[PDB]
A paper describes a structure:
As a key member of the basic helix-loop-helix PER–ARNT–SIM (bHLH-PAS) family, [name] exerts regulatory functions through interactions with specific partners. Using the Human Reference Interactome (HuRI), we identified hypoxia-inducible factor 2 alpha ([name], also known as [name]), another bHLH-PAS family member, as the most abundantly expressed [name] interactor in human LV (largest node in Fig. 2a). [name] modulates the circadian hypoxic response by enhancing the transcriptional activity of [name] and stabilizing the [name] protein. Collectively, our study provides the structural basis of the DNA-bound [name]–[name] heterodimer, highlighting its role in regulating target genes, such as AREG, and the capability of [name] in bridging diverse pathways through structural rearrangements for partner binding.
To determine the structure using single-particle cryo-EM, we expressed and purified the N-terminal regions of [name] and [name], including the bHLH and PAS domains, bound to a 22-bp DNA containing a canonical HRE element. After two-dimensional (2D) and three-dimensional (3D) classification, the final approximately 43,000 polished particles were processed for 3D refinement, resulting in a density map with an average resolution of 3.6 Å. In brief, [name] exhibited a better overall resolution compared with [name], probably due to its compact structure and stabilization by [name]. In the structure, [name] and [name] exhibit distinct architectures. [name] adopts a compact conformation, with the PAS-A domain bridging the bHLH and PAS-B domains, whereas the corresponding domains in [name] are arranged more loosely, lacking interdomain contacts. [name] uses its bHLH and PAS domains to wrap around their respective counterparts in [name], establishing four major interfaces (I to IV). Notably, the structure of [name] bound to [name] differs significantly from that of its complex with CLOCK8, in which the PAS domains of [name] are tightly packed together. By contrast, in the [name]–[name] structure, the PAS domains of [name] are positioned separately and arranged in a conformation similar to the HIF1B observed in its complex with [name]. As both [name]–CLOCK and [name]–[name] complexes bind to DNA through their bHLH domains, we superimposed the bHLH domain of [name] and observed that its PAS domains bend in nearly opposite directions. In the [name]–[name] structure, two PAS-B domains form an open end-to-end alpha–beta dimer, with the conserved Trp427 in [name] interacting with Met250 in [name] to stabilize the PAS-B dimer.
Author numbering:
A (entry chain A): 13 to 75, 89 to 150, 164 to 173, 186 to 200, 220 to 355
B (entry chain B): 75 to 101, 111 to 125, 145 to 163, 168 to 209, 243 to 253, 280 to 290, 312 to 320, 338 to 344, ...
Write the structure that this text describes.
DNA sequence: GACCCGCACGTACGCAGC
DNA sequence: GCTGCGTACGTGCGGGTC
């Protein structure tokens, strides 16, 4: 009859003291007052640990307008699949803010059975480049990644737009084209004659896998199957011949459409960047 | 009845995070007390974003301002470009390009002068702000004509293209080459070599290549050596 | 007019000594 | 040989979001 009272009184006091210590540790945080002091208890711990790590491993390799005038955001991860820091512009290119995504697992936001490559990239072996797809009623989204690895990895992120609505002034050396599912030409814009000079009557069912040169084919095959498996692609460096021989350099960022009535990938198209002028004028190869 | 599992798991995460902090500090309400103490002694971005995508900041209009070490990627000093025109620093094709591209976002390349620079930016005051960022032959069927092969085997491309390999090949060892051709036809991946000739010993490596959609092999691409 | 989750309220015990 | 600190687990009670 006497044990319960002592136990409950001591327990009540200890409960109160623990929650109060928790909240005070929460108070001093990089976040402002309003949106930090009224959060759930689970996020406080991971947010504080994330701040500690991003202020600790920052000095491991250490010694006003860089975030803006920059397309995308800066992320960073470790080998356990957990981002630490995110840039403030994250709230305009994938839809969410920093506070919910600052210590959670990338595995719970990426596409499952599309992560063995990421788990291989994150481990040790200085220069790593790859591709990665990432995010309620969440629709999936595409993404491009570059950077250097410490063990951590600091990454750059530049998503591709959709040429259905293009908010950029395409230049006079940026011609448009459309292709078919098996890398076969269908249509060329009327911007080509001044740049490299073909006629559309030849730009037809001829296979596109003929103009690439030397190792360009054995790398754009990987780029094409990357577009087949993913939604988009950004190609590194390749050429495409002209009407009188020689190579002219072009780069692309492809896309894939879907159908309101169906589920297959219907149509693909590219955007072209004329880089160098016509080269090796006289000599021909085909 | 069966929320015990979800609450057990969340308890497990709770105790793991409250228990592992000892590593991140250089040393359990005592632990939280010393940690909230430790928080009190609490341009960091350069130290990663300089290492993240290379490049350096320049501003356009003249040109008004750059980073400290721009000669790392462009090879120019700091006072030899201020008070100095960007137009009298560039190639003329890119001159017409940037004249067309002077006046929200800007995805554009350059062919700048001491170097193909992919750079992005936005307008400000008029003026501009933008970060910058930097004895063999090869042919295949032979539909394709290489570069040094016509000096190698002494034959102009007015006599080779658009014909089969063994049409002109001397069939003194056409059999072992035939056996190799059968094996490399469906081998994919890496194919090694055995001897072949023309008078001129060429030791072919072939790579079975294939459209990753139509699922039917069409072309190969050689890296023929001697 | 409610379903799922986070926080709080209950106890049945490993341990050190007078 | 038997009593207060630290601990583990079950149960309810009440706040959003569709």
């Amino acid at each position: 009859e006497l044990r319960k009272e002592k136990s409950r009184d001591a327990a009540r006091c200890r409960r109160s003291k623990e929650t109060e210590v928790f909240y005070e540790l929460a108070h001093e945080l990089p976040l402002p007052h309003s949106v930090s002091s009224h959060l759930d208890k689970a996020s406080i711990m991971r947010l504080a640990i994330s701040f500690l790590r991003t202020h600790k491993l920052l000095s491991s390799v250490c010694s006003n307008l860089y975030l803006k005038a920059l397309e995308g955001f800066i992320a960073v991860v470790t080998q356990d699949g957990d981002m630490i820091f995110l840039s403030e512009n994250i709230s305009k290119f994938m839809g969410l803010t920093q506070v919910e995504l600052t210590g959670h697992s990338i595995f719970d936001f990426t596409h499952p059975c599309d992560h063995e490559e990421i788990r291989e990239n994150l481990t040790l072996k200085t220069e790593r480049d790859f591709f990665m797809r990432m995010k309620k009623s969440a629709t999936w989204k595409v993404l491009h990644c570059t950077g250097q690895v410490r063990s951590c990895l600091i990454i750059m992120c530049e998503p591709i737009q959709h040429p259905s609505h293009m908010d950029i002034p395409l230049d006079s050396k940026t011609f448009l084209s459309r292709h078919s599912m098996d890398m076969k030409f269908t249509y060329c814009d009327d911007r080509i004659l001044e740049l490299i000079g073909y006629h559309p009557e030849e730009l037809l069912g001829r296979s596109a896998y003929e103009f690439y040169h030397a190792l360009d084919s054995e790398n754009m095959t990987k780029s094409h199957q990357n577009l087949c498996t993913k939604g988009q692609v950004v190609s590194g460096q390749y050429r495409m011949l002209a009407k009188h021989g020689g190579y002219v350099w072009l780069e692309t960022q492809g896309t894939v459409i879907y159908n309101p009535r169906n589920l297959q990938p219907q149509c693909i198209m590219c955007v072209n960047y004329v880089l160098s002028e016509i080269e090796k004028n006289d000599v021909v190869f085909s | 009845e069966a929320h015990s599992q979800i609450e057990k798991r969340r308890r497990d995460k709770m105790n793991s995070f409250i228990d592992e902090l000892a590593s991140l500090v250089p040393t359990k309400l005592t632990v939280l007390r010393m940690a909230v103490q430790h928080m009190k002694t609490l341009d960091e971005l350069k130290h990663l974003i300089l290492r993240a995508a290379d490049g350096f900041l320049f501003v356009v209009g003249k040109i008004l301002f750059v980073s400290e070490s721009v000669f790392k990627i462009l090879n120019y000093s700091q006072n030899d470009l201020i008070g100095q025109s960007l137009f009298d620093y560039l190639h003329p094709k890119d001159i017409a390009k940037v004249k067309e591209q002077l006046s929200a976002r800007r995805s554009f390349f350059c062919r700048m002068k001491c170097c193909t620079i992919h750079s992005t930016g936005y307008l400000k005051s008029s003026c501009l702000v933008a970060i910058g960022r930097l004895m063999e032959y090869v042919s295949r069927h032979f539909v394709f004509v290489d570069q040094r092969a016509t000096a190698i085997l002494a034959y102009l491309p007015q006599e080779l293209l658009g014909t089969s390999c063994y049409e002109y090949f001397h069939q003194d060892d056409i059999g072992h080459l035939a056996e190799c051709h059968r094996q490399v036809l469906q081998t994919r991946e890496k194919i090694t070599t055995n001897c072949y000739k023309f008078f001129i010993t060429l030791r072919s490596r072939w790579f079975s290549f294939m459209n990753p959609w139509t699922k039917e092999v069409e072309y190969i691409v050689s890296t023929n050596t001697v």
